[PDB]
Amino acid sequence: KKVVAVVKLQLPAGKATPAPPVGPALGQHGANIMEFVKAFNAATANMGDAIVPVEITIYADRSFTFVTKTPPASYLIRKAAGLEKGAHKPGREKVGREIAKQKMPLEAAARMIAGSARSMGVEVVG
Amino acid sequence: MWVYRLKGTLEALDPILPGLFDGGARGLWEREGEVWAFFPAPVDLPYEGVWEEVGDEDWLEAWRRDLKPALAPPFVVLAPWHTWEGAEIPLVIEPGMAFGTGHAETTRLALKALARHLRPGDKVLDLGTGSGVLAIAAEKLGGKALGVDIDPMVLPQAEANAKRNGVRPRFLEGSLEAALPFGPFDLLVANLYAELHAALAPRYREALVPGGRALLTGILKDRAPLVREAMAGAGFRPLEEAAEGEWVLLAYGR
Ligand SMILES: Nc1ncnc2c1ncn2[C@@H]1O[C@H](CSCC[C@H](N)C(=O)O)[C@@H](O)[C@H]1O
Ligand SMILES: [Cl-]
Ligand SMILES: [Cl-]
């Protein structure tokens, strides 16, 4: 097995389709797009609407394997803090207010996790 | 469809990726020094990327049309949706997550060598079975096949491919040592790589009956001496060499 490509995508959990980026990214190397879509969606079925980073390794005969990762740190901070699209209405709007352990791959790395939140700028309680 | 092109990797751009999705991105693709975000329609974004309209393909159709049956006489290696009219022995292999779709020169080398060397009824070790392709082909040629692989992920795939062909090779997790009790074999086929052939040569000899054949491929042309030196030292007789591209197959008699 000799690697011909390593394709890095981020896709919506349970929601891959053969449309771009999946289609062109896998298609360039002849990988089975439909097989990827199906396995990806099966593997991320219990994940809600999370962003799932996914790495596809493609071989010279078009076979491939993939690894999924943990959602991006910025996504987790935002979701836990109530930040969502849609209902931006005139008048008052409220700012927002562990993930270190889910995102660590040793110890208190939550220093640029609490810090990223404030750069965001989400208020932390404790 | 539209793409929003941003300088940087996914790592570098981590803080802005949720915003791309909240803006309507359907997925992200890291390319050479860029992230491509795909949207149905352009939106006003604060990220300083660039909007470009891309042409909309039916990617499933493009992929099906460029994926052709793989001829390796006497076999044709077909995807499940393929139709075929010729007289070739069909081998149905799902192009999936296991090496041995039939689209490698080495897989094809090994398929043709099987037809040259495999006697009906003979016992066959497919070392490094992957998709199961070679063990299935061996069954089609009248052999009884054991396909082994150290990668447990491929074995359910090899099993499911065997069902697409109405055959049941024995499939097993492990390597040459785990196959030994099922032998000795009449025929060994091994699409691996040069260095592993050189290391396993003396154990190849023990795996085979007298007059048994080893068909070895996955060998880069320039790495072939390692295998020649090793198979000589293990006491094998050379039967033939076959080449395709930068690859060789080397055939030996015990
Ligand atoms: N030491 C070892 N013992 C058994 N299998 C091995 C091995 N090293 C690699 N393999 C397996 O050998 C396969 C090589 S790819 C070959 C697949 C198939 N026989 C074909 O001809 O196309 C892979 O599935 C890999 O997991
Ligand atoms: Cl057996
Ligand atoms: Cl038995």
Q: What is the resolution of this structure in A?
A: 2.3
CA–CA dist B110, B116 (Å, integer): 10
B219 in the same domain as B105: yes
Same structural domain for residues B57 and B111?
A: no
Claim to verify: residue B69 and residue B57 sit in the same structural domain: no
Helix (H) or strand (E) holding A25: helix A22-27
Size of interface A-B (CB pairs under 8 A): 120
CA B190 to CA B152: how far, in whole Å?
17
State how far the Cα of A19 lies from the Cα of B39, in Å rounded to an integer: 11
C-alpha B94: how far from chain center: 11
Q: Is the same domain home to B135 and B153?
A: yes
Minimal CA separation from A22 to chain B, in Å: 8
Determine the residue of B109, B150, B203 to mutate for testing ligand 1's pocket, defined as the one with the most ligand atoms within 8 A of the Cβ atom: B150
Q: Is B123 helix (H, G, I), strand (E, B) or coil?
A: strand
| Number of domains making up chain B | 2
Residue B128 labeled ligand binder:
yes
Where do the CATH 1.10.10.250 domains begin and end in chain A?
70-126
Q: Name the burial class of residue B9, with classes exposed (0-12), middle (13-18) and buried (19+) by CB atoms within 10 angstroms of its CB.
A: middle
Which ligand 1 atom is at minimum distance from the Cα of B174?
A: 4
Residue of A nearest to B30 (CA): A8
- Reduce the DSSP state of residue B34 to 3 states and report it: strand
Residue A5, phi then psi, degrees to nearest 5: -160, 150
Q: Do residues B49 and B81 both lie within one domain?
A: no
Whether residue B4 is found in the same domain as residue B115:
no
Is-contact A51 B19, C-beta < 8 A? no
- Take residue B204 and report the two structure tokens written for it: 């190849």
Same domain, B244 and B120: yes
DSSP secondary structure code for residue B154 in this structure: G
Q: Are residues B49 and B109 in the same domain?
A: no
Would you say B209 and B180 are in contact if contact means Cβ atoms under 8 Å apart? no
Q: Which two tokens stand for residue B245?
A: 């591209």
Which residue in A6, A8, A10, A36 has the most chain B C-beta atoms within 10 A of its own C-beta, making it the best mutation to test that interface?
A10
A32·B104 Cβ contact <8 A: no
**A1-69: which CATH number, 3.40.50.300, 3.40.50.720, 3.30.1550.10, 1.10.4080.10?**
3.30.1550.10
Q: For residue A101, give the DSSP letter.
A: H
Instruction: Tell me the two tokens of residue A118.
Output: 């404030």
Instruction: Give dist(CA B115, CA B251) in Å, integer.
Output: 13
Q: How far is CA B118 from the centre of its chain?
A: 21
Residues B210 and B95 in one domain: yes
| Residues B216, B188: Cα–Cα separation, whole Å | 8
- For residue B10, the chain A residues in CB contact (below 8 A) are 8, 10, 53
Asked if A88 reaches chain B (Cβ–Cβ under 8 Å), the answer is no
Concatenated DSSP letters of A31-75: --HHHHHHHHHHHTTTSTT-EEEEEEEEETTS-EEEEE-PPPHHH
For chain B, the first-to-last Cα distance in angstroms comes to 61
Q: In terms of residue numbers, what domain contains B35?
A: 1-62
Beta strand B144-149 pairing with B123-127: parallel
How is residue A87 written in tokens?
């209902």
- Residue type at A39 in one-letter notation: A
CATH assignment at residue B243: 3.40.50.150
How far is B85 from B107, CA to CA, in rounded Å?
22
Nearest-Å Rg of the Cα atoms of chain A is 18
Q: Is B149 annotated as a binding residue?
A: yes
Give B210-249 as a DSSP string.
EEEEEEEEEEEGGGHHHHHHHHHHTTPEEEEEEEETTEEE
Distance CA(B99)–CA(B130), nearest Å, equals 5
Integer CA distances (angstroms), B51 to B34, B35, B112, in order: 13, 12, 51
Residues B70 and B174 grouped into a single domain: yes
Does residue B130 share a domain with residue B28? Answer: no
Q: Give one word for B249, left, alpha or beta, with left for phi > 0 and alpha for psi -120 to 50.
A: beta
Contact call for A20 and B104, based on CB within 8 A: no
CATH number for the A70-126 domain, one of 3.40.50.2300, 1.20.5.440, 1.10.510.10, 1.10.10.250?
A: 1.10.10.250
Residue A28 amino acid letter: Q
Q: Which amino acid is residue A52, in one-letter code? A: V
B175 annotated as belonging to a binding site for a ligand = yes
Q: Name the residue type at position A95.
A: V
The answer to whether the CB of B182 falls within 8 A of the CB of B171 is no
Q: Which atom of ligand 1 is nearest to the CA of A1?
A: 15
Pairing, β A64-68 against β B2-7: unpaired
User: Which structural technique was applied?
Assistant: X-ray
Q: Which atom belonging to ligand 1 lies closest to the Cα atom of B102?
A: 22
Give the phi and the psi of residue B156 in degrees, each rounded to 5: -65, -30
Strand B247-253 to strand B237-244: parallel, antiparallel, or no bridges (unpaired)? antiparallel
CA atoms within 13 A on the CB side of B166: 3
Residues 6+ apart with CB under 8 A from B22: A84, A85
- The neighbouring-strand residues paired with B75 are B72, B89
Angle at B61 between CA B245 and CA B159, to 5 degrees: 65
- Examine the domain organization and report whether B162 and B238 are in the same domain: yes
CA-based radius of gyration for chain B: 23
The residue whose CA is least distant from atom 19 of ligand 1 is B129
Q: How far apart are CA A85 and CA B194, in angstroms?
A: 55
Cite the residue boundaries of each domain of chain A with CATH code 3.30.1550.10: 1-69
SS3 B113: helix
> Domain with B49 in it: what CATH number?
3.30.70.1170
Q: Which of A19, A65, A72 sits opposite B14 (nearest CB)?
A: A72
Task: Check: CB of residue A117 under 8 Å from CB of residue A81.
Answer: yes
Q: Dihedral sign for Cα B177, B179, B181, B185, please.
A: negative
